[PDB]
Amino acid sequence: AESHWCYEVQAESSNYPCLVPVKWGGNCQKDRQSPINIVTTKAKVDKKLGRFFFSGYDKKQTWTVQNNGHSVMMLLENKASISGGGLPAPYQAKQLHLHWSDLPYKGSEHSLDGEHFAMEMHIVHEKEKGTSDPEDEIAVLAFLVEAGTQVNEGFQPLVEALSNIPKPEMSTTMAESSLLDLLPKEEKLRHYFRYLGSLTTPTCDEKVVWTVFREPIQLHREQILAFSQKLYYDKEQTVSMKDNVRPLQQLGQRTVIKS
Ligand SMILES: CC(=O)Nc1nnc(S(N)(=O)=O)s1
Numbered sequence: 001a002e003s004h005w006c007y008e009v010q011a012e013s014s015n016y017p018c019l020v021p022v023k024w025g026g027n028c029q030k031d032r033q034s035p036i037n038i039v040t041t042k043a044k045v046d047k048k049l050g051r052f053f054f055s056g057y058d059k060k061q062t063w064t065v066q067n068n069g070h071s072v073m074m075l076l077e078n079k080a081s082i083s084g085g086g087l088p089a090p091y092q093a094k095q096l097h098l099h100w101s102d103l104p105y106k107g108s109e110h111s112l113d114g115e116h117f118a119m120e121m122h123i124v125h126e127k128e129k130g131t132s133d134p135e136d137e138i139a140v141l142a143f144l145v146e147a148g149t150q151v152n153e154g155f156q157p158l159v160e161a162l163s164n165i166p167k168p169e170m171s172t173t174m175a176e177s178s179l180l181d182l183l184p185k186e187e188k189l190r191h192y193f194r195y196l197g198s199l200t201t202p203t204c205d206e207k208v209v210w211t212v213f214r215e216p217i218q219l220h221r222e223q224i225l226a227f228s229q230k231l232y233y234d235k236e237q238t239v240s241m242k243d244n245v246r247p248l249q250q251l252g253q254r255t256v257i258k259s
């Protein structure tokens with residue numbers, strides 16, 4: 001490529017040339033890409049999609065959180081894992097990160113029935129393989145975030161940490177907190193959508209089994225704004241981190257199923 005990959009907002013907000021999403025390389029131009037719009041009434045029920053088992057999600061830890069230049073990322077270091085959820089194996093948690101905007105009607109990568117949410121949180125896990133790379137090497141759990149007036153206390157350790165990592169490659173330690181602190185109530189997580197796709201940043205490898213939960217996380221408008229107010233794409237701090245969102249891709253001949 002002739003320059004570093006970026007999101008559209010970065011190219012629009014700076015005179016420094018970068019490669020916008022439609023121009024991304026790697027596998028980004030192949031035909032099983034993510035994110036997608038989900039028509040919820042067209043997704044077929046698959047009874048084999050049962051409940052998830054979240055392991056290590058309840059435990060209070062002091063997570064390392066970092067600005068990687070295109071998101072904020074918690075390092076999960078195999079300290080959590082998942083099974084069930086119609087998955088073919090257990091998966092080890094690697095990192096958690098987010099995509100957002102600063103307007104309530106956009107910020108998520110996926111849309112449900114043409115509606116974008118204020119943020120989307122991705123928990124990235126790796127497959128525990130056997131002897132028999134695969135289409136489902138990575139399991140990403142996607143949670144949509146709806147802006148409101150409810151202060152989400154569970155999110156405060158993360159939101160407070162943001163002031164400490166404004167620039168790329170900066171890391172800090174979050175106050176004691178659990179992954180469940182960040183999620184909707186567990187019982188609400190029985191309803192989710194499932195399809196096979198890609199990572200949503202270069203090289204956009206087609207190795208992700210996606211889960212998009214129906215239940216949104218409720219976050220106060222100003223907790224969401226704290227992301228774009230405190231974070232930057234560059235050490236120069238010329239472009240606030242927001243609209244770190246890949247445009248919608250075509251489902252093509254794929255099928256979306258639901259629990
Ligand atoms: C470092 C790493 O895990 N790569 C990721 N790239 N895109 C991802 S996402 N947005 O689809 O969850 S994760």
Ligand SMILES: [Zn+2]
Pocket residue numbers: 097098099122200
């Ligand atoms: Zn992501």
